[PDB]
Design a protein around this ligand. Sequence first.
Ligand SMILES: CC(C)Oc1cc(Cl)ccc1CNc1cc(-c2ccccc2)nc2ncnn12
Ligand SMILES: CC(C)Oc1cc(Cl)ccc1CNc1cc(-c2ccccc2)nc2ncnn12
Ligand SMILES: CCCCCCCCCCCCO
Lengths: 214, 58, 264, 255, 339
Amino acid sequence: EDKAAVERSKMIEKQLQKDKQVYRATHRLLLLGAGESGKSTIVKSGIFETKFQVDKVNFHMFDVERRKWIQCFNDVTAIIFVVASSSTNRLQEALNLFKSIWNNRWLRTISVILFLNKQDLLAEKVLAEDYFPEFARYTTPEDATPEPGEDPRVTRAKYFIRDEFLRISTASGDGRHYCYPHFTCAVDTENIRRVFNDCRDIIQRMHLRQYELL
Amino acid sequence: NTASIAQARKLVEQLKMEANIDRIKVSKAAADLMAYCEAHAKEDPLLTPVPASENPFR
Amino acid sequence: PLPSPKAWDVVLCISGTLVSCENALVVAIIVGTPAFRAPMFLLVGSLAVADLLAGLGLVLHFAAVFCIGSAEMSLVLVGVLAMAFTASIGSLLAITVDRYLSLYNALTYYSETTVTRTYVMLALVWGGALGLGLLPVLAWNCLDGLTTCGVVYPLSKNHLVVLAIAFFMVFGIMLQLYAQICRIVCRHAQQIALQRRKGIATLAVVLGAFAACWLPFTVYCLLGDAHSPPLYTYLTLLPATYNSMINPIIYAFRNQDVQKVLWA
Amino acid sequence: PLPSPKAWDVVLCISGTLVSCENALVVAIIVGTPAFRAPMFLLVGSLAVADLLAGLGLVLHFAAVFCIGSAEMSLVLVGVLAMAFTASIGSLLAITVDRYLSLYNALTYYSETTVTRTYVMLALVWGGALGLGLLPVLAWNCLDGLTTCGVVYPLSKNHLVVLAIAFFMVFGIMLQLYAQICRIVCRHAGIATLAVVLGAFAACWLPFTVYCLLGDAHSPPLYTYLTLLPATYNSMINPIIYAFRNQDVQKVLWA
Amino acid sequence: SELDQLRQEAEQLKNQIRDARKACADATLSQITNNIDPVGRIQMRTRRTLRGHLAKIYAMHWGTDSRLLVSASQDGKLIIWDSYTTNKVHAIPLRSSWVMTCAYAPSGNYVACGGLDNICSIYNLKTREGNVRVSRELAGHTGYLSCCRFLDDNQIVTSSGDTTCALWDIETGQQTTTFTGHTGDVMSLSLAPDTRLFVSGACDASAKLWDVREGMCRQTFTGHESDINAICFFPNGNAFATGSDDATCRLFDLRADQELMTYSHDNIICGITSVSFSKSGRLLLAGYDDFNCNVWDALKADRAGVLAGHDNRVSCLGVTDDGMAVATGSWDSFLKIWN
Ligand SMILES: CC(C)Oc1cc(Cl)ccc1CNc1cc(-c2ccccc2)nc2ncnn12
Ligand SMILES: CC(C)Oc1cc(Cl)ccc1CNc1cc(-c2ccccc2)nc2ncnn12
Ligand SMILES: CCCCCCCCCCCCO
C-alpha cells in the first residue's frame, strides 16, 4: 500500500508548492507604536494584522518587556515606527525605545519608516518644546522645504524634532539599513504612497549594495 | 499593603518549606548515576554503531 | 612531417588551459550545493560553462594540430570555438540585462516571471550560439574555394562581417543599459548624500575591460583580408581569450556568498 | 558637357530638389513664429536644417559636376553631403531620447536642466557630424594614390567602414529605447507608430551601410546607385510624418 | 512591620539554607568520574535530511515510535514527516503566523501548537472525513506560549511569558491549577519521565522545581547569571541540565541542591538554544548559536565532538524514543536527520 502513501506525499508536496508560490508574492512590515501616537489613524488575539494593496502588489502589516519577541521579525521588509510630536518628556521615552531598537545586535537588515505624527498640536503649542537645552543651540537646515503658511519657529521645531531620530540612526549601521522621515499630521490621505515608495527604495538599495556598486 | 504582605508571607512559607529538605550526599548520587550508565551503556547506538542490517536509516 | 609550433601558439595554449582550470573551479563551486539554484547564479553558471567549452576547445585544437598530426578534425574545433565565444557574449549580455530588471522591478522580483524571463533569454542565447557555430560548417565555408577566405585560415569574409555587426549591436544595447543603471545609482547616491562617488567606478572598469578585450579583434578584422601578416591574428585574438580570465573573477568571486565557500 | 549625364543622376537630382523644397516649407513655418522654444520645437529644427542641407548639396553637386569642371567643388560638395547625411541620423536618436525622458519623468522632466540637456545633445550631434564629415577633405582621400578607397570614388574604405561601425553602434542605443518605451507604456499605463518608425529607419538606411563591408571596390556603379537611392527616400519621409502631424505646424501656417 | 521583619527572617533563612547546602556537599563528581574510560570520538552524519519548509523552524517533538516527526515554522504550516522515506502524511494550515512551540501526543493521536497567539489550540487526527479540523481552543493566558508538553491524552501543561504555568483539560478546558513564583519569562518546561513532576527555566537567572498535583515549589536552583533557554530531565528522573546565553551548559542534581558540573569553554562565546541527553545519559548535546551542534561528555566535561553542518541558527534538538536519531532543526527550513 506504499503506492497510496507516495501519491499522498506527492499531492501534499504540490499543494505546498502552490501555497509557497502564493506566499512569495507579498511583503511584511512591523508597527512599533509608542502606545497612543494615533496607531488607529495611521492604519490607512494580541496579534492584529492588516492587508492593504498598492498597484496590485498586496502588502502585509501587523502590530505587536519587548526585549524578546523581536526575534520573530528578523525578515520584515521594514519597520513602520510611529512617533508622537507632542512633548512631560515622553518624547525621551520614544527616543530611548528607538535607540534600543537600533543597536538590537540581531536586527541588522531592517530599515525604519518614521511617521512623525500629530503636527497640529505641536504647531498650536509652539505658536501659543523648550525642555531640552539643545534646542536653543540649533539652526534650521539650509535646505529646508517648508510648505506654504509656516512660521520660522514652527519650522525650527519641526526640523529639530526630526534631527534627533536621525542624528543617531546614521551613526552605526555599516551601510546596511537607513531611516526615512515622512512628516505627516493627523491631516493627510496619501501616507499609503509614502510606504510603497519607501519599500521600493529599500529593496532597490539592498539589491544595489548586493551588486557592490555604491 | 495587602498584596505586599501576601507576597511576603508566601515567600516565608516557600522558604521555610524548602529549608527543611533532606540533602542526600553527592557521593551516592554519583554512584547511582554510574550504575545507571553501566546498566545502560550497551543500548547506546549513538555511542556503539550498528550495521545496516538493523539500521533502517540507509 | 609536421609543423614546428611557434611561441605565440604555446602562449595561446597555456592561456586556454588557465581559463579552463579557472572556469572548471568556478562551475564546481556553483554546482556543489543545491542551494545556489538562483537566476543570477544560474546565468553565472551558464557563463562559466561557455568559457569552459571555449578553453577546452582551444586546448584540444592545439593538441590536434602540432602534436597529433591531423587537420580534417580541426574544423569542428574552430566551429566549437565560434559557438563558445558567441555563447559567452550572449551570456554576458544576459547577465547585464537581468541586472537591470532587478533594479527596476524590485517589488515584483522573486516570482515565476523572472524564471520564465531567464529561461527564455538563456534559450535564445544558446540557440544563437549554436547557429553561429554551425554556420562555418555549412554552405558558407571557404574550404571549397568558391568564396574569399578572411584573416582566419579556415574562415571566410561574410561570417566575420555578420559576427562583427551582431557584436556591435549588442555593444550598443549594453551601453544603453549601463547608462540607465548609472542614472538610477546616481539618484540613490544623491538621496543618501542629502542627509550628510564609488557608484560609477565599477561600471567604468567593467565597460573598459570588456571594450579593450573584445573591440580590437573585430575592428582589425573588418578592415582586413586574407593577406595580412601572420602575427596580426594572434595579436588580435590574445585579448579575446584573456577576457575569460577576467570575466569569471569579476562575476563570481567579488560576490560575498561564494567567497566564504572558496575560503574553505 | 563631356560627362553627358544619364537617367540615374537626373533621378537623384529630382529627389534632392523635392527634399529641399519640402524642407524649406517646413522650416519656414517653424522659424516664422519667434515664440517656439520648447524642446521639441528646437530639436526638430536641427533635423529639418540638416535634411535641407543634404538635399541642397545633392542638387548643387549634380548641377555643378555636369555643367562645369567642379572637381574640387565636387569634392567639397560630397563632403557637405556626408555632413548632412550624418546630421540627419545623429539627430533622430537625440529626439527619441528626449521623448523617452519626457515620458518617463512624467512630472519631473520640466525644469531648467531640460534646456541644457537639449543644448548638449545638439552640440554632440553637430560635433559628431563635423568629425565624420571632415575626413573626405582630410588625410583620408581616394584621390591620392594607393588607398584602395571604398564603394564610391572619393571615399576611403577605412573612412566608410568607420562610419558604418559608428552607425551600427548608434543602431543599438536607439534599438533598446523602443523596448524601454514599450515597457513604460505597458506598465505605467501607440506601439504601432513606434514600430513603423523603427521599420522605416532600418529598411531605408540599413542597405547602404551593409553594402560597404561586404564589397570593397571596383564594383559596378549600378549597385551603388540602387543602394544609395533609399537614403533620399528616408531623408524625404522623415519630416513628413515626424513633425508635420501635430497642430504646431498647420496652426501657424494657416494664420 | 509592613515588610521589614519578613525580609530579615527570609534573609537569615536563606543564609542558613545555603550554609547547609554547601555543608551537605563533599566534592564534585569530577574526581569520582575521572577514572571512567573517555570513550572519545563520536560518529554521526546525515541520512535523509528533510526539506520543504517555507521559513525558519522553531520546535519539533519526536513521536512515540521514533519514526514520526512534527515541526512548525513562521508560515502557519504544521506538517507531519516520516524519517524513513521523507513523505508528508498530513499538513496542517494554522491561523496565526508566529508559532513558537510544538508537541506530540503520547498515543500519537492529538497534536498541539501555539506561539505568539496567546493560545494552545490542538488538532485531532481521527476525523471521519479524513482531514484535520481544529479542536477546543484552550485559551486564557496573558502571553506567548513557549512550550506545551503532554502529561496524558487529557491534560496539557503549558508555559507563558507572563510568569505562569497552568495545566488544562480537553473535556471542557479550565486551568485547574496555576503554578507561580517566578519573576521573568518561563522559557521552557521539561516533563518528568514518570509524569509525576516537572521543571521549568525562567528568564530571571533561575529554574526552580515544581510539583505535579499541588503546585507547590519545593526547591531553588540559582544558576546561570544570564537568561535560560532549555531544560531536560535525566533518563532516571534524578537530574536535569540547563542551558544559557553565556556559552555555559551545566547540569544540576535534585539531591545536591547546588551546581554539579560546568561545560564552559572560552573558544566560542555564542549563545545556547537547546540541550539533550544521550540515550545512555553520557553525552550532552548543545545547540550553540554558531550553527555548530556540539556534543559534550556528561562526566568528563570535555568536548567529545564538533559535529555540525548547518548554515542558519540551530534551534531544535532532541533524541528519538530509543536511540534511532538525533534530529536537529535549524532556521533554513531543513530538518537534518542525523545518525
Ligand atoms: C538579449 C535579447 C534577447 O534581448 C533583447 C531583444 C530585443 Cl529584440 C531588443 C532588446 C533586447 C535587450 N533589452 C531588453 C530585453 C528585455 C527582455 C524581454 C523579454 C525577454 C527577455 C528580455 N527586457 C528589457 N527591458 C529593458 N531592456 N530589455
Ligand atoms: C545621443 C547621445 C548623446 O546619448 C547617449 C550617449 C551614450 Cl554614450 C549612451 C547613451 C545615450 C542615450 N541615453 C541617455 C543619454 C543621456 C544624456 C546624458 C548627458 C547628455 C546628453 C544625454 N541621458 C540619458 N538618460 C537615460 N538615457 N540617457
Ligand atoms: C558621451 C555621453 C555619455 C553619457 C553618460 C551618461 C551620464 C549620466 C549622468 C547622470 C546625472 C544624474 O544627475
